[PDB]
Amino acid sequence: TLPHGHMQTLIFLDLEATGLPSSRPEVTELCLLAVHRRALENTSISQGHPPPVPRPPRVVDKLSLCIAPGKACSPGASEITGLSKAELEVQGRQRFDDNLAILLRAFLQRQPQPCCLVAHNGDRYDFPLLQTELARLSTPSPLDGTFCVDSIAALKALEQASSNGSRKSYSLGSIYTRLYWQAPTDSHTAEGDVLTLLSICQWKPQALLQWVDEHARPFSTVKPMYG
Amino acid sequence: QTLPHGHMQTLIFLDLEATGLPSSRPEVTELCLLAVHRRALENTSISQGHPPPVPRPPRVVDKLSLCIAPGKACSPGASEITGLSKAELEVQGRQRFDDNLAILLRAFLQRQPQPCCLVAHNGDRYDFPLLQTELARLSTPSPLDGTFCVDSIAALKALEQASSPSGSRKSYSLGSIYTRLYWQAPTDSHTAEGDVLTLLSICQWKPQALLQWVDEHARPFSTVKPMYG
Ligand SMILES: Nc1ncnc2c1ncn2[C@@H]1O[C@H](COP(=O)(O)O)[C@@H](O)[C@H]1O
Ligand SMILES: Nc1ncnc2c1ncn2[C@@H]1O[C@H](COP(=O)(O)O)[C@@H](O)[C@H]1O
Ligand SMILES: [Mg+2]
Ligand SMILES: [Mg+2]
Ligand SMILES: [Mg+2]
Ligand SMILES: [Mg+2]
Ligand code: NA
Ligand code: NA
Ligand code: NA
């Protein structure tokens, strides 16, 4: 039996930030895309080889926010994301603050529970970093009742256990292009990367949901990236 | 040269889908807000060529798009053009327009620099009065009581008439304007996010004149009369 029941809402998540973990980075952009499990189960199943890119579900909740960091972006981060401290501050973006936590809470509370965050490389990056950002706030984390999984492990199972010990790349773009023979769009933007992740999770939608139900773990158990 | 409420620092392009036309007493089924700082509009390339290319949206934007379970069914035409129905919103677990949505909207708005102005196509007769009606049902105070609002139909009418002198009858539907300016068909029409992006594009056509028109005509959302009781 499933450890936490059937997930009713999948929230595809991506973050951009000031740099890589050893720089103690800060979030500069956040996108959440909430999809009911029934929207995934209604995705058309693949049309041969290569299949077409699935279309996103009609009924979706989307939140995309730009966030001013308290430190400069690494050159490598600015180079790929198109974001910098100057871009964000000149356009009046606010810091990762209590009000943001409230916004996230109200967004989550509009989704049927339980919810599971899905992020590519989430276990090593997105989830620990979000935990760090939320832990330094006064508002309690709005995610302590939410679950999470890493889509890297999900797509590894769906690819390996369904079709050669050869290693495959599991970067977000490599997966997308391997499945659909097509280049992702708007790479290294929070929203663009979330839509790419949604497309690869729509590849085998019922298999993905089952794997998520089986591997969802509480977000509260995620260790912060740094203190 | 003396503005009514100062320079608008944030423009929030806004669109709603709903269950039908005003005579049906509609309820909102989808809401999208796209918040753009005024400097992103100041730094938009002006349109030259024929047709001009569709402007690039700003890199830095805040976006909120939410589907909402209505208390009444969509009209057949409304359901077809929007791709939404009451039954499907309910099986996908969408919640009604409620207090928590007002809290979400409030927190979203507070992340934007003030003063802040909603921009909606046909907002003065439809979106703003309908939102006022929806918010009036709630126990929470309106999260829009300090926000301003303008209708982009009037804006584009002013902008287009200034760009070709008088003395015919043109449609000012969202799609007609877009296709007139850019010789392109809009994408994702009659979806809240799609129409908000199309609205952004027409507002970027003459972005300095749009900002000036908005500064001159912004009025408090609190003054909007509800569509119905
Ligand atoms: N080469 C890189 N140099 C610096 N930061 C990077 C690099 N690759 C990824 N990142 C960081 O990781 C964040 C998330 O990556 P992604 O979701 O793949 O765009 C980015 O916003 C950057 O802060
Ligand atoms: N041609 C139309 N026929 C019926 N209803 C419409 C029509 N245009 C707009 N509406 C209604 O008004 C709402 C807002 O219009 P729009 O933003 O142009 O999609 C829609 O969701 C429908 O409920
Ligand atoms: Mg990522
Ligand atoms: Mg990314
Ligand atoms: Mg509209
Ligand atoms: Mg619309
Ligand atoms: Na923080
Ligand atoms: Na499947
Ligand atoms: Na202009």
Author numbering:
A (entry chain B): 5 to 167, 171 to 234
B (entry chain A): 4 to 170, 173 to 234
Quoted from the paper:
Three prime repair exonuclease 1 (TREX1) is a crucial enzyme in mammalian cells, consisting of an N-terminal nuclease domain and a C-terminal transmembrane domain. TREX1 acts as a 3′-to-5′ exonuclease in the cytoplasm and the nucleus, and has multiple roles in cells (1–3). TREX1 is a member of the DEDDh exonuclease family and adopts a general two-metal ion mechanism for catalysis similar to other members. Our results show that RNA and DNA/RNA hybrids are substrates of TREX1, although the activity of digestion is lower compared with that of processing ssDNA.
With the various RNA or DNA substrates digested by mTREX1 during crystallization, only a single nucleotide is left in the active site. The base region of AMP is stacked by Leu24 and Ile84. In comparison with the mTREX1–DNA structure, the extra 2′-OH group in the ribonucleotide interacts with the main chains of Gly23 and Ala21 and the side chain of Tyr129 through hydrogen bonds. The three-dimensional structure of the ribonucleotide with the extra 2′-OH group fits well into the active site of mTREX1, demonstrating hindrance-free binding with the ribonucleotide. To understand how substrate binding depends on the base structure, the ribonucleotides in the mTREX1–RNA product (AMP) and mTREX1–ribonucleotide (CMP and UMP) structures as well as the deoxyribonucleotides in the mTREX1–DNA product (dGMP and dCMP) and mTREX1–deoxyribonucleotide (dAMP) structures were superposed. Our analysis reveals that AMP, CMP and UMP all align well, with the scissile phosphate and ribose in identical positions. To explore the difference between deoxy- and ribonucleotides, a comparison of the superimposed structures of dAMP and AMP shows a consistent binding position, except for the absence of the 2′-OH group in the former.
